[PDB]
Symmetry: D2
Subunit: 283 residues, 4 copies
């Protein structure tokens, strides 16, 4: 499996043509699973889910989608509440690929999109696996914006290598994972004109009139499916206290917390994460 062998594109309608790039693996496997990556500026499906796609592809038909504004998907200069926007694009994709009710795996921003999709199109979403998810989290104890959020904001206003490194360093428990190569790689992608446009778009969406759609903790009591919340104990972006409302109010919720693990669960605990996900999704 390679970036190129799995690469796919699709055009869907979200207030007009919207191009989506995604990776497909495990064709032939009966149960399709959709992965939605995290929200760092230089993040994408392939890099986010490197330690995972090949593994999950052994059991499922994997569709790893680049969310609008990331990777090789369209990067519009404007949009509404981001999760609702990305949800609309996923719906377009689902319809185009003839998918019915499919399970979703999403981390951080991508978890927020998974949930918004599950609420907006309740019939199309199966079991959910959510790693340090945004949107349904509400930080009962941590002052907002968190360190992780603030660091992303700083890079958004001052796109320097120094600021990106500082940001990345609060993504993980083992800061040794933030190597010069990783920093340089993410920075090349995060600082392109298009990524900056995406960032400026994200910023302006924050102050829209549809902010309620992002406050998903008020709604998840409506979800009828099994939901596996997965958290790194040392998550500094969406901290562990953010798990509580969702654990309490989602009827068929479960929670797994890994000690010695940060915001990037799929990386720092890739083996443990892969195994939980396979078992959960009935594979």
């Amino acid at each position: 499996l390679t970036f190129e062998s799995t690469s796919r594109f699709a055009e869907v309608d979200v207030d007009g043509p919207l191009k989506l790039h995604y990776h497909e693996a495990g064709v032939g496997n009966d149960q399709t699973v959709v992965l939605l990556h995290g929200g760092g500026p230089g993040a994408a499906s392939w890099t986010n889910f490197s330690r995972n796609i090949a593994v999950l592809a052994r059991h499922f038909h994997v569709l790893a989608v680049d969310q609008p504004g990331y990777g090789h998907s369209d990067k519009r200069a404007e949009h509404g509440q981001f999760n609702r926007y990305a949800a609309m694009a996923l719906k377009g994709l689902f319809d185009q690929l003839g998918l019915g009710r499919v399970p979703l795996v999403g981390n951080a921003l991508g978890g927020g999109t998974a949930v918004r999709f599950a609420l907006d199109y309740p019939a199309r979403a199966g079991r959910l696996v959510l790693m340090g998810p945004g949107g349904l989290s509400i930080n009962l104890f941590a002052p907002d914006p968190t360190e992780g959020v603030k660091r992303l904001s700083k890079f958004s206003v001052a796109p320097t290598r120094e600021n990106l490194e500082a940001f990345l360093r609060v993504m993980v428990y083992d800061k040794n994972l933030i190597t010069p190569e990783l920093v340089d790689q993410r920075f090349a992608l995060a600082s392109t004109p298009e990524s900056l446009t995406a960032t400026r778009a994200m910023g302006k969406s924050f102050a829209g009139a549809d902010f309620e759609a992002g406050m998903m903790w008020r709604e998840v009591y409506r979800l009828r499916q099994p939901v596996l919340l997965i958290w790194g104990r040392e998550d500094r972006v969406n901290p562990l206290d953010g798990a509580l409302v969702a654990l309490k109010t989602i009827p068929r919720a479960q929670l797994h917390v890994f000690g010695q693990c940060g915001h990037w669960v799929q990386v720092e605990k890739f083996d443990e994460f892969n195994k939980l996900t396979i078992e959960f999704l009935g594979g």
Copy 2:
């Protein structure tokens, strides 16, 4: 596997001869695992771990031990802090069976004993799997005694079928699990003279000068092994808020919470519990 085929007895020294009854299964499997049951008056290894021993025995050499004062182990009329006492007996057993460093699975009271053992004899305890454990839990939000604890206390003072049923009913989420047969069975065992003696002994131990040994939340930051905490979201004996100090302070801790599950995790979520335990213990 039957109660009889697996039954074993051992005499160990805890301030003198102390008889221990236990169940052995999976002989021939390389990795030994010790299970320590919960603390209801009519509880024992065989009934506590019915949905589990045969399964785990497929992967491990299972020793399910009746804790002093329960099942067919000696039921003394007096002893110190219970967990420290039961720990001493386990040490005697370990030494007698030539066991070295072995993983421990313990629920409720039995989890408290697993931990006390891991702290008192740090070299002899491997990975720990703890389901709604006592001792290392401190209920940060729930007033003590909890409903579950209070109900056990009531039966201890008034040993009637009515009181035992009320107690059992707060052990599970699905109260339908508390059938007349289950109630009658537990009551026959819980109301024998010896079980009453055990209960009276437990009560008097509470007010000993060694109470600190029971406050294990002050010590678990010393544990060096991986520890899997498992909780039922609706646990009414040792509630979920009791997990927090241990999750935070145990370096290699993990936590799994099951929604729609009470204090009896191994029963209400036996399949999910069995699978977590097997994977965790490297089997």
Copy 3:
């Protein structure tokens, strides 16, 4: 000040004539304050706020209102979401007494009514003082129904002195406060035909289609006024973990927790409670 000297009645419109009994004290004091009592079956303004009305009346114009279904207010056999219903009655009273924007002090059920009123008629509610309030609380850790709620339910199905005593005993930290006289007094009021009707009405309202109105934790982020949450650490009806969503989401929120204090804050910590309330309400 006596029950009789302060007694007042008013007829308001809530889907037709609805009689409200209330107590008025401190006439002449410039700032009016409305108190809303707790929800025990034999509860009322006078008994709920005995250690408080005379004190607060020294600083404010006190209107202690019996909520519909309690004390000497109408006790209808049917109504919708209770808090929304009681809110409508308070609005009727406000309008009739020419009140404008007034602060509200409410405990337990009465706190839930204060909040529902503040959300439904945002202009008419000033600062809020809420003691172990229902409605805006969501018990993130305690399994529901709590012991306190369950005990009230038991009395509702089996209205015996024994059951009421058991209920009352989980209202306080110092169980010595539950004297035979208190038990007999509350029982005489709680077991009248009208109180039973009120109870049966409350029960049926629980399963109405307007249940969302009771889930006030989803809405309190809309409140613009200062709100003082007051909790007994050992509250066994609406436990301390229920405070968290409201503390986090109410912009001008404050929280005070008293150790060694149960659900009846105004009783067990009457002096401390009185003083916090006076200072808070700017008196």
Copy 4:
């Protein structure tokens, strides 16, 4: 009252002569109260408690002490667990001034010293008022070091105005409070050779063999006096989740949380803080 009019010095014995600078006010008032300031590098009694000393001095005999390593107290290049060290110095002062059992008000680092003193010399400590205290706090949800702690660490390694400003900005909710004048003032004091020595001393103490003395959350269940914990909801140094073990385990504990308030409670909510403290200390 001025810095100069209230200035006092004392020589006490802590492994030899140790000079302590402090401020005395309200002489003639019967009840003495000791204040222990926070731990920012340029922090001291006078600046920490500016909005408070004159006020409290109206009701009490105020002794605001500069903790060793701060203000005008000795700044040694080496010492053990800081709180235990500062406690020893306070004991020396108490003895020298003929003080008996006196209440203590301490914020942040100074709260940790108040507690260590109360545990080490149980007879000499009366009621405690603790604002965002260190030592007895254990951050159950926030990854450590917190943003606040990390920012102080950065300044300790790179003592620039930029780094101090960033640090100060996470001390308050209203960042407008961090004016250029405040930044310049604190920086002049924080960057002196002696303050750097103090900082280097603090750093080396962290890795001493007496680290347990700093883990005061394991001990506060021994405190017999009333203790008022006060927290800013948006505290980014010692966050609100740090309050929980102490609230639960201190028998006569109380907690007050102010929304829209950071780590500097005595500044951002000086009026509310002053009033709580006066009432609590029985004045």
